[PDB]
């Protein structure tokens, strides 16, 4: 009955998506041809008369070199070929080109396949979109993707899983230019929106998973485990079951603030799993470490508004509420005085499943915390400084302006970003 639609936008969306959909098939025991050798698969797969399953995913891309690798590999028989949407020409790291020039040629094809998938749904819990701030139409076409979804669909959930531009490492020069102009869309047309930046995931894989040389496949296996633990309360029985709309309402203090931080615990190797036990209290303390956080910001600087936790495995409610008491006793961590009861707890019996060839090991007890802090103002004023530092001498403006957008729209992104950072300042003051 319950079901969602995945919208993998961009080259990062495809590499994330095939990491997620590889994990889903082995989780539900479905072969690459789609036929198995119970309604757990109903949330993402669609049943036909012949015994197959079609994933409810739409791949949004503007370059054919990233779709044809999907159509050639092992999963060529899995996905329906009309779900993979390829543009004729890439915007090539341009928000403006994917907003006014390139994106309106295939905006009709995306909304048509959205209509077909939502027609098959008997009741639609929400949408998941996957994209990155850095790229052109991963940030650009996503901006006009939300405009059509919000107007057509009123109160349907639309989750925005994003990748923030890292403060130090980058693969572009116009990367801060693309990120700030997407603040207009996400502030207005997003029910929820996560972010993890790549520099933080770089620190964890070096020291926790014991990998000298990882690529984006080992990062996207980690991000697949985050989404799997989120949606498994929809797919499997739980001692406490938490739906998609449940923790959506319970983490946001204001409609202007819908930006949690995601962390996962434990992340250890199969040789280090031979040594250390993994209990409920041991994995609870690991989510509060600023080293193991998956965003380069320190909650020790800021203040927690609310907390959402997602437990999986041999998890007893006795040990959950015992470890919460220990965390409130330590004075290194703080909570705002206007949220005394800030936690939310969910438990599922099924342990997380592992992928063959992956880096992690199979674990009984795991937790995926969703905490909203005032430490996100640390990673915004840094990017607002660098967006102001480049734009002081008026650089790269001729490429964006000449494509159709006026020069005053850059100044519009200044005040909306300046006002949004002011709304996070008034949260942290105590009454």
């Amino acid at each position: 009955m319950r079901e969602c639609i995945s919208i993998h936008v961009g080259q990062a969306g495809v590499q994330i998506g095939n990491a997620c959909w590889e994990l889903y098939c082995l989780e539900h025991g479905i072969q690459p041809d789609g036929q198995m050798p119970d309604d757990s698969f109903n949330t993402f797969f669609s049943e036909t008369g012949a015994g197959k399953h079609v994933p409810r995913a739409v791949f949004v891309d503007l370059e054919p070199t990233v779709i044809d690798e999907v159509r050639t590999g092992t999963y060529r028989q899995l996905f329906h070929p009309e779900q993979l949407i390829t543009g004729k020409e890439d915007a090539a790291n341009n928000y403006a080109r994917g907003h006014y020039t390139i994106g309106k040629e295939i905006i009709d094809l995306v909304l048509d396949r959205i209509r077909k998938l939502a027609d098959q749904c008997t009741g639609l819990q929400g949408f998941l979109v996957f994209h990155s701030f850095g790229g052109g139409t991963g940030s650009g076409f996503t901006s006009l993707l939300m405009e059509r979804l919000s107007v057509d669909y009123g109160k349907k959930s639309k989750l925005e899983f994003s990748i923030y531009p890292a403060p130090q490492v980058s693969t572009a020069v116009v990367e801060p230019y693309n990120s700030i102009l997407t603040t207009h869309t996400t502030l207005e047309h997003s029910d929820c929106a996560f972010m993890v930046d790549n520099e933080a995931i770089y620190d964890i894989c070096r020291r926790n998973l014991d990998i000298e040389r990882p690529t984006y496949t080992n990062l996207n296996r980690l991000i697949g485990q985050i989404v799997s633990s989120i949606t498994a309360s929809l797919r499997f029985d739980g001692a406490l079951n938490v739906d998609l709309t449940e923790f959506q309402t319970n983490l946001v203090p204001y409609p202007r603030i819908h930006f949690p931080l995601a962390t996962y615990a434990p992340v250890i190797s199969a040789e280090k799993a031979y040594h250390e036990q993994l209990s409920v209290a041991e994995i609870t303390n690991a989510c509060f470490e600023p080293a193991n956080q998956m965003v380069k910001c320190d909650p020790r600087h800021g203040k927690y508004m609310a907390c959402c936790l997602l437990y999986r495995g041999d998890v007893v409610p006795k040990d959950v509420n015992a470890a919460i008491a220990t965390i409130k006793t330590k004075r290194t961590i703080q909570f705002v005085d206007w949220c005394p009861t800030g936690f939310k707890v969910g438990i599922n019996y099924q342990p997380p499943t592992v992928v063959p060839g992956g880096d992690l090991a199979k674990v009984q007890r795991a937790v995926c915390m969703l905490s909203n802090t005032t430490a996100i103002a640390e990673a915004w004023a840094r990017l607002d400084h660098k967006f102001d530092l480049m734009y002081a001498k008026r650089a790269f403006v001729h490429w964006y302006v000449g494509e159709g957008m006026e020069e005053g729209e850059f100044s519009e992104a200044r005040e909306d970003m300046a006002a949004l950072e002011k709304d996070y300042e008034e949260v942290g003051v105590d009454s």
């Binding site: 009955m1 590499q15 095939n18 990491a19 590889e22 082995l26 025991g29 072969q31 690459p32 050798p37 119970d38 309604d39 757990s40 690798e69 050639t72 590999g73 092992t74 999963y75 690529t215 496949t217 797919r235 499997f236 029985d237 019996y349 099924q350 063959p356 060839g357």
Partner: protein, 111 residues
């Protein structure tokens, strides 16, 4: 104002040295294994539906092209094919056991 009595012999010697330097294609009929188009034959015009043989080499090329990368290559060539390369289960899939494998089960009232 050109001199055509010289232009014609310039073209003649040009074509002649092109004839001297011409080397033919060595009859290696290579075709792409991806896609080639067909034209549908007539229903009644029996000049189209003659009995005529079909190549088996290109059949083998189709049956080798429509295949998985693991079956094609012994070792992986690129990095984007690494996901899903090993699809085998390390433990047998005892999904029938409701003891250790909790799953959602349909009820008669909802259906």
């Amino acid at each position: 104002i050109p001199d055509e009595v010289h232009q014609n012999q310039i073209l003649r010697e040009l074509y002649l040295k092109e004839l001297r330097t011409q080397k033919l294609y060595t009859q290696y009929h290579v075709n792409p294994l991806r896609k080639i188009h067909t034209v549908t034959r007539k229903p009644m015009s029996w000049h189209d539906n003659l009995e005529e043989p079909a190549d088996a080499r290109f059949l083998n090329l189709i049956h080798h092209a429509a295949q998985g990368p693991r079956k094609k290559y012994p070792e992986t060539q690129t990095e984007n094919q690494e996901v899903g390369w090993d699809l085998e289960p390390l433990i047998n899939p005892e999904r029938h056991d409701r003891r250790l494998n909790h799953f959602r089960v349909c009820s008669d009232i909802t259906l």
